[PDB]
Design an enzyme around this catalytic site. Structure first.
Site, PDB file in Angstrom:
ATOM      1  N   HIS C 109       0.799  -1.229   0.000  1.00 38.45           N
ATOM      2  CA  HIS C 109       0.000   0.000   0.000  1.00 38.45           C
ATOM      3  C   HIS C 109       0.827   1.272   0.000  1.00 38.45           C
ATOM      4  O   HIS C 109       0.757   2.035   0.960  1.00 38.45           O
ATOM      5  CB  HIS C 109      -0.968   0.055   1.179  1.00 38.45           C
ATOM      6  CG  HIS C 109      -2.020   1.104   1.016  1.00 38.45           C
ATOM      7  ND1 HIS C 109      -1.820   2.421   1.370  1.00 38.45           N
ATOM      8  CD2 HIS C 109      -3.260   1.045   0.477  1.00 38.45           C
ATOM      9  CE1 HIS C 109      -2.905   3.119   1.091  1.00 38.45           C
ATOM     10  NE2 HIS C 109      -3.794   2.309   0.547  1.00 38.45           N
ATOM     11  N   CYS C 126       0.450  -3.038   8.166  1.00 33.35           N
ATOM     12  CA  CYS C 126       1.029  -1.809   7.619  1.00 33.35           C
ATOM     13  C   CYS C 126       0.499  -0.596   8.409  1.00 33.35           C
ATOM     14  O   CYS C 126      -0.595  -0.114   8.120  1.00 33.35           O
ATOM     15  CB  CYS C 126       0.760  -1.771   6.092  1.00 33.35           C
ATOM     16  SG  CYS C 126       1.599  -0.560   5.025  1.00 33.35           S
ATOM     17  N   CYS C 128       1.016   2.364   8.285  1.00 31.10           N
ATOM     18  CA  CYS C 128       0.747   3.544   7.478  1.00 31.10           C
ATOM     19  C   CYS C 128      -0.709   3.692   7.077  1.00 31.10           C
ATOM     20  O   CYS C 128      -1.230   4.804   7.054  1.00 31.10           O
ATOM     21  CB  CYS C 128       1.616   3.513   6.223  1.00 31.10           C
ATOM     22  SG  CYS C 128       3.374   3.243   6.544  1.00 31.10           S
ATOM     23  N   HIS C 129      -1.372   2.591   6.746  1.00 27.46           N
ATOM     24  CA  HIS C 129      -2.746   2.693   6.263  1.00 27.46           C
ATOM     25  C   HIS C 129      -3.629   1.570   6.785  1.00 27.46           C
ATOM     26  O   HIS C 129      -4.736   1.365   6.291  1.00 27.46           O
ATOM     27  CB  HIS C 129      -2.761   2.689   4.733  1.00 27.46           C
ATOM     28  CG  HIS C 129      -1.539   3.293   4.117  1.00 27.46           C
ATOM     29  ND1 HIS C 129      -0.438   2.545   3.764  1.00 27.46           N
ATOM     30  CD2 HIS C 129      -1.243   4.574   3.798  1.00 27.46           C
ATOM     31  CE1 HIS C 129       0.482   3.339   3.248  1.00 27.46           C
ATOM     32  NE2 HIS C 129       0.020   4.576   3.258  1.00 27.46           N
ATOM     33  N   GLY C 130      -3.147   0.842   7.783  1.00 29.77           N
ATOM     34  CA  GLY C 130      -3.911  -0.273   8.315  1.00 29.77           C
ATOM     35  C   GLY C 130      -4.108  -1.514   7.464  1.00 29.77           C
ATOM     36  O   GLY C 130      -5.227  -2.035   7.383  1.00 29.77           O
TER      37      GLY C 130
END
Ligand SMILES: CCCCCCCCCCCCCCCCCC(=O)OC[C@H](COP(=O)(O)OCCN)OC(=O)CCCCCCCCCCCCCCCCC
Ligand code: HEC
Ligand code: HEM
Ligand code: HEM
Ligand code: HEM
Ligand SMILES: COc1c(O)c(C)c(C/C=C(\C)CC/C=C(\C)CC/C=C(/C)CC/C=C(\C)CC/C=C(\C)CCC=C(C)C)c(O)c1OC
Ligand SMILES: COc1c(O)c(C)c(C/C=C(\C)CC/C=C(\C)CC/C=C(/C)CC/C=C(\C)CC/C=C(\C)CCC=C(C)C)c(O)c1OC
Lengths: 373, 238, 164, 34, 48, 98, 76, 66, 184, 38, 54
Positions: C109, C126, C128-130
């Site tokens: 992602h 991740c 950063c964005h789940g």
């Protein structure tokens, strides 16, 4: 004298509208900020070293032993923040007062905006902190969206499999060289404007009331420069770390990743949009459109009045647009979880629908109310 | 989900409140006697102290206190010299791995910019060092861990390093755990920004100069712009 | 007239060749340099990772994640069926030996470090964005498009895995 | 009248695109595309 | 005072001259003053 | 609808600064043409009206209420002319397609 | 440039020398009334979008917290 | 050697608002312990109490300390 | 079109003398050389490091590991030499044909000549070879000649007691920034 | 002239196409010459 | 060039340093990939990233 001909005409006797408010100061502030950035950037370049080996330290040395070096570094960072504040207010002035009908000036503007965003992104990568490295990887990988052309292109910029020294050094070169292209594009921006002259907040033909610039809008620009210098210094000398991020004070660890990663404030509105669209590609495109929708703006003007001084419904729609731009700036900050996501999705839908659909329909309605349509 | 350290009325917090510079002295002593065994103040060199809380010759003393061996030697691959003013603070566990080895694979982050690198650092630091409370029910920290409500995850490898009277302050100020955590938070702060004091003086001069210069430039602008702002227009069709 | 025009067409053709060669050089220059290219070197010790542990190696810059899996991860991973699996991949086809899971280590992602064993499905995550990756490194929840790429690891032996 | 105008350029326009396209494939040295 | 204008401001050069001299002295005063003010402000918390 | 109109009128404000609707029409190519055709008086009058507005804006001030335009008084001086410019403009256009 | 900018007629324009006029005449005398006059004419167009931004921001924060709140029925 | 913090934490806990909070947490503690098959922990409960206690300490700790 | 009018005014419809020889080409060549230098310089800047430990190593890495990096480096060096060849012939044309009576053009020219010489000097210092270091010390020492403020000025430029990393990095910054001033 | 030298468009096409082939041809001949010399 | 590389390898290498030339540069010039790989595996190097091994 050839030069003085260019000078006096352009900077002293330029017939300017007598009634332009303080918002018209902001573009001149941007030019000053550009020079300030360049000057501070030059004094960062005499001690910075692009080597991933010494970057973090180079910068540390900059804020520790370089004489007044902390002053020049934090002036550079907060001057980038001041540049984006003045840029956003300049674009908002152009949107509110109908200045986008100067189409060539507007298009050179949106080119300048793209160049400034790229310059600030690579400059934020340059200190090689934890946050810089993960930030670079992240939207660089964003470029990895394109199916056939994207992947290779990414490593091309990365100059390798993953961002590493190869990137840092070429990002130093590009971050050095782009503000001079920005200065040349700003000269083209000023030219494409003097052909038409500046606009006034009433949006009417100000040819009957124009005054010189030397004694009237010069001391005004000097006062605006003084106020902008007051805000910058008081954002460097008293609150120096307010706009930055703490995780950038750690060295770049490829093995760890900052738990909470976010773009700087100015790049957030875009960040929100990107996150909102489920599809990766969709996000990238929407993101781009976010900036590009502005260029598209001079073709959406359907009103017989240039400015929004006499247009209250479109004033309400404009302030709703500023409102959900602030909302998108907030959402970007918030992490991925309910209900931040939905707001982001709506806020993006409302942003594109207000710019694309609601303002020309409102201008048609406003023309109908004045018995013009 | 993390405990958010409260706001303490740190002295230096004041707009023009410089760092104590007396406290720091104490704080460093805390770093030298406790924190230097695992953490590395890489970006702070003995010389840096001169002018803040230790005088030139005085610093020379401390510099010599430690020993620094440099490899370049005519025939030898090193020569050991007591630290000079220029020498930077001695980092233990030369390779991070060394540190990991002995620290349960947890790298003691350099505390040089720790306050700047940690959100709400000064507070965090104080909280973490003083947040070593009892683990709750259901928690199962892995081997070699401790419980601090603030640390991300509440599982910091670092064992609680400040036991009341851990070290004796040369100044004699009672070495209570807190008095020690506050001193080391001030010092680490200083470390992360040796110019804190100098800057605030520049900011005070900037506020005085802008308070002088803004109404005067406003008065010059309103002089030159009065002419127009008084202009009276009249339409006189013949 | 044709001749004169022919002359320039020829000249233009030559120029095209000229311009073509030069630009390629510059792009390639900026493109991966030999040193960058000469980094595919990689070797790892299996014994390095106890079951259910994510190990880092940063091979090729990308922080390499050579992870090991616990009994649950080693066995339940297959229980994902297929429809249950967000992606169309197969959990074990990702690992010659189930216990040893080898992956690049960058959530698809937009790139980031997967957080192993954290998340909703567990196995990888991740921040950063789940994006939640299972032990197989397959994206199960979130916005990450595809499963974590599995590098060309060579299971030379049970104690030392050398991708290259 | 406009239709006639359009008709005249349609083929030439394609020619132009083709011209660039030929060079495009060449410049791109794309073996995949032509 | 007319004297000021008649003597110091009338001649543009003097206008500059006075500014120049003033600048030469302003620094001294402002620096010292601000320094002390600062010193007083942080009366006890300093290196001394 | 007059209520609406008059209300919108006060809301727009162009009245406050002594400017009739027409005074506030962007100078597009067509509008510009009509402006030229304007009999000199209206033109000169238009100019003072506009110049006056500019001065007021300069001081961020509005005219005394009494001097404000009145929804009823407001006359459209250019409308009759503008239509022609548009009509002529369109005619030429269709003829182009011929 | 100047001289060829526009055509006006019979518009007389009086003015005064800067040094002959006070610097901030009636500054706070009428400045306040005017600033207040101004704020009235624009507050209803400007303020309610930012008011509902404040409500949405607070709402989001509180909602998020509640979201983070543990289900009573959770693990019981 | 009485660490001012120690004393402050006493007074702060003595604050009724804080008192009520601790009670809630203890309920959680026993509830959690009493519950056999569960994973819910009082960490969140612990967290909430602390915020308050700390805030209070914040108001009275710095001065106590020297 | 206000952008195309200047381009037309300076390159298309500009009335030029019909009988100017090949020497009048040279100034345009100089402009081309300037671009060429800038372009090659930009592609040296993506791999060069202005650190005294790594400057020679970065130059050898450019010549040996970057694809066609030797080509861009030797194009940059021989393009500096070609720049000075075209500059000397341009100045000789101006001296021979009496073009110095265009006094403002001549003075802007000699300013450009000073800027180009300073740029080439600091660029030659940049690879941090044996010859670069001793050459820099020498000319920097030239400044010390100044009667009263000489020592200070030299030390300022050097940024220290003697040329060392302090110099290299500021010489990289100045060598980067001056060709854009030359273009203006 | 009647195919590639009548109108600019035609001229453009031949240029693109010819350049496309000349590139390889030039390199090929160079191969011979280069190898010939060495 | 292959014969001269041998000379360095045997006689002049013990005292002079060919730092900027690496085993990679030889491939396609004097040796193949496997020959240069064998030549490189003939000289040990130091990495020192071991948990403790430095
Ligand atoms: C904040 C609110 C400032 C304000 O006062 O808004 C109302 C103001 C009224 O001005 P107006 O109706 O022209 O009347 C002038 C009378 N002398 O109208 C204005 O102040 C217009 C201000 C124009 C610039 C506003 C910029 C706001 C920020 C926009 C950022 C985003 C821009 C787009 C980015 C993509
Ligand atoms: C004798 C050992 C030891 C002493 C004494 C010690 N530490 Fe540490 N510290 C560690 C180890 C081991 C880690 C790594 C823990 C981890 O990363 O989870 C650590 C990590 C930290 C961190 C990182 C927390 C974070 O946010 O990631 C901070 C802050 C810290 N220590 C502060 C201090 C302060 C402040 C003192 C004293 C005033 C101190 N330490 C004394 C061993 C020590
Ligand atoms: C040619 C002029 C410029 C030069 C030479 C220059 C040089 C540099 C250098 C060397 C750095 C690294 C210092 C550091 O980040 O620690 C840097 C950082 C940076 N530059 Fe620039 N810069 C220039 C113009 C700009 C402009 C115009 C902007 C704004 C668009 C900008 C924004 C930044 C930012 C945001 C950083 C990172 C600040 C941080 O560390 O957080 N710079 N610049
Ligand atoms: C940092 C980059 C930019 C600089 C330095 C800059 C500078 C300027 C300057 C000096 C002016 C003269 C008038 C004034 O300042 O008020 C101006 C006008 C203008 N700019 Fe920009 N600008 C920039 C970016 C943009 C962008 C991104 C846009 C489009 C959103 C834009 C749109 C305009 C418009 C429409 C005008 C004419 C406004 C008027 O004079 O009435 N500019 N710019
Ligand atoms: C902004 C444009 C320029 C940039 C970015 C630039 C950049 C560089 C860099 C990074 C180097 C060190 C690596 C190398 O080239 O060997 C260098 C060297 C050099 N540059 Fe420049 N340069 C520029 C313009 C110029 C110009 C206009 C001249 C001629 C006056 C010049 C003359 C040189 C010379 C003589 C060297 C030393 C070459 C050598 O190492 O043998 N450069 N340049
Ligand atoms: C009257 O109309 C004008 C006008 O004539 C000019 C020239 C400027 C330009 C003013 C500035 C000082 C901005 C500077 C612009 C640049 C070219 C930035 C480039 C920066 C450099 C490094 C030089 C205006 O802003 C302006 O409207 C107010
Ligand atoms: C009188 O005839 C002319 C002439 O009018 C012009 C403009 C040029 C300039 C044209 C060039 C190609 C020279 C380069 C021009 C520049 C403006 C250089 C720009 C490059 C930068 C890096 C800036 C000539 O060389 C010339 O004589 C042949």
């Amino acid at each position: 004298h050839p030069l003085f001909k260019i000078i006096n005409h352009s900077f002293i006797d330029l017939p300017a509208p007598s009634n332009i408010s303080s918002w018209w100061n902001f573009g001149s502030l941007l030019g000053v900020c550009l020079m300030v950035q360049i000057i501070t950037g030059l004094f960062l370049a005499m001690h910075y070293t692009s080597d991933t080996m010494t970057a973090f330290s180079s910068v540390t040395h900059i804020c520790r032993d370089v004489n007044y070096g902390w002053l020049i570094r934090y002036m550079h960072a907060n001057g980038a923040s001041m540049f984006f504040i003045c840029l956003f207010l300049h674009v908002g002035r152009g949107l509110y007062y109908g200045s986008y009908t100067f189409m060539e000036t507007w298009n050179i503007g949106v080119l300048l905006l793209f160049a400034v965003m790229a310059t600030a992104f690579m400059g934020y990568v340059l200190p090689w902190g934890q946050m810089s490295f993960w930030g670079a990887t992240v939207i660089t990988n964003l470029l990895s969206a394109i199916p056939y052309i994207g992947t290779t292109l990414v490593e091309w910029i990365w100059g390798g499999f993953s961002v590493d020294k190869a990137t840092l050094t070429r990002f130093f070169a590009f971050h050095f060289i782009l503000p001079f292209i920005i200065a040349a594009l700003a000269i083209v921006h000023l030219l494409f404007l003097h052909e038409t002259g500046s606009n006034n907040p009433t949006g009417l033909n100000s040819d009957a009331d124009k005054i010189p610039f030397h004694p009237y809008y010069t001391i005004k620009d000097i006062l605006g420069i003084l106020i902008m210098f007051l805000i910058l210094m008081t954002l460097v000398l008293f609150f120096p770390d307010m706009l930055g991020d703490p995780d950038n004070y750690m060295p770049a660890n490829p093995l760890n990743t900052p738990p909470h990663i976010k773009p700087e404030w100015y790049f957030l509105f875009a960040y929100a949009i990107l996150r909102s669209i489920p599809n990766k590609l969709g996000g990238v495109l929407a993101l781009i459109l976010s900036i590009l929708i502005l260029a598209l703006m001079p073709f959406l003007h359907t009103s017989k009045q240039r400015s929004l001084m006499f247009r209250p419904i479109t004033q309400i729609l404009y302030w709703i647009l500023v409102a959900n731009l602030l909302i998108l700036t907030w959402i970007g900050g918030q992490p991925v979880e309910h209900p931040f996501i939905i707001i982001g999705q709506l806020a993006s839908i409302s942003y594109f629908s207000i710019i694309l659909i609601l303002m020309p329909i409102s201008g048609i309605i406003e023309d109908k109310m004045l018995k013009l349509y | 989900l993390e405990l958010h350290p409260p706001s303490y009325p740190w002295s230096h917090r004041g707009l023009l409140s410089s760092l104590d510079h007396t406290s720091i002295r104490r704080g460093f002593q805390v770093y030298k006697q406790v924190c230097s065994s695992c953490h590395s103040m890489d970006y702070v060199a003995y010389r840096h102290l001169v002018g803040v809380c230790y005088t030139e010759e005085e610093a020379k003393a401390l510099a010599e206190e430690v020993e620094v061996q440099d490899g370049p030697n005519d025939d030898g691959e090193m020569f050991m010299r007591p630290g000079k003013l220029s020498d930077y603070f001695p980092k233990p566990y030369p390779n991070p791995e060394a540190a990991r080895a002995a620290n349960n694979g947890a790298l003691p982050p350099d505390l040089s910019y720790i306050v700047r690198a940690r959100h709400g650092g000064e507070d965090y630091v104080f909280s973490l060092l003083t947040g070593y409370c009892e683990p709750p029910t259901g928690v199962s920290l892995r081997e070699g861990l401790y419980f601090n409500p603030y640390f991300p995850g509440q599982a910091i490898g670092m064992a609680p390093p400040i036991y009341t009277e851990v070290l004796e302050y040369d100044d004699g100020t009672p070495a209570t755990m807190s008095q020690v955590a506050k001193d080391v938070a001030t010092f680490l702060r200083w470390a992360s920004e040796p110019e804190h004091d100098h800057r605030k003086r520049m900011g005070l001069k900037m506020l005085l100069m802008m308070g002088l210069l803004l109404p005067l430039t406003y008065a010059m602008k309103r002089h030159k712009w009065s002419v127009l702002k008084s202009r009276k227009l009249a339409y006189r069709p013949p | 007239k044709g001749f004169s025009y022919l002359v320039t067409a020829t000249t233009t053709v030559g120029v095209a060749y000229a311009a073509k060669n030069v630009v390629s050089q510059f792009v390639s220059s900026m493109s991966a340099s030999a040193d960058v290219l000469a980094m595919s070197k990689i070797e790892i010790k299996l014994s390095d990772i106890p079951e259910g542990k994510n190990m880092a190696f940063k091979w090729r810059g990308k922080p390499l994640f050579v992870r090991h899996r616990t009994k649950k991860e080693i066995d339940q991973e297959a229980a994902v069926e297929v429809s249950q699996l967000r992606d169309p991949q197969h959990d074990l086809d990702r690992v010659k030996k189930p216990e040893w899971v080898i992956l690049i280590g960058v959530c698809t992602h937009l790139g980031c470090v997967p957080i192993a064993n954290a998340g909703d499905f567990g196995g990888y995550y991740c921040p950063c964005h789940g994006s939640h990756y299972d032990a197989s490194g397959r994206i199960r929840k979130g916005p990450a498009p595809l499963n974590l790429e599995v590098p060309a690891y060579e299971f030379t032996s049970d104690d030392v895995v050398v991708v290259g | 009248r406009y239709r006639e105008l359009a008709r005249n350029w349609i083929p030439t326009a394609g020619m132009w695109g083709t011209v660039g396209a030929v060079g495009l494939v060449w410049a791109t040295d794309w073996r995949l595309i032509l | 005072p007319s004297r000021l204008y008649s003597l110091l401001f009338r001649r543009t050069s003097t206008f500059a001259l006075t500014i120049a001299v003033g600048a030469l002295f302003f620094e001294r005063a402002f620096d010292q003053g601000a320094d002390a003010i600062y010193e007083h402000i942080n009366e006890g918390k300093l290196w001394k | 609808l007059d209520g609406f109109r008059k209300w919108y009128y006060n809301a727009a404000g162009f009245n406050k600064l002594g400017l009739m609707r027409d005074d506030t029409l962007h100078e597009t190519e067509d509008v510009k043409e009509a402006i030229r055709r304007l009999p000199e008086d209206l033109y000169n009058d238009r100019m003072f009206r506009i110049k006056r507005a500019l001065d007021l804006t300069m001081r961020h001030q509005i005219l005394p209420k009494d001097q404000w335009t009145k929804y009823e008084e407001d006359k459209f001086y250019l409308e009759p002319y503008l239509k022609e410019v548009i009509r002529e403009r369109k005619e030429r256009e269709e003829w182009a397609k011929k | 440039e100047f001289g060829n900018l526009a055509r006006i007629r019979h518009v007389i324009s009086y003015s005064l020398s800067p040094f002959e006029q006070r610097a901030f005449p009636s500054y706070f005398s009428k400045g306040i009334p005017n600033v207040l006059r101004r704020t009235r004419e624009r507050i209803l167009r400007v303020a309610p979008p930012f008011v509902v931004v404040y409500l949405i921001y607070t709402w989001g924060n509180q909602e998020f917290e509640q979201s983070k709140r543990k289900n009573p029925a959770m693990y019981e | 050697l009485v660490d001012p913090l120690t004393t402050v934490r006493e007074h702060c806990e003595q604050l009724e608002k804080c008192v009520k909070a601790r009670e809630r947490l203890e309920l959680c503690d026993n509830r959690v312990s009493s519950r056999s098959q569960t994973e819910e922990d009082c960490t969140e409960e612990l967290f909430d109490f602390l915020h308050a206690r700390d805030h209070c300490v914040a108001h009275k700790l710095f001065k106590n300390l020297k």
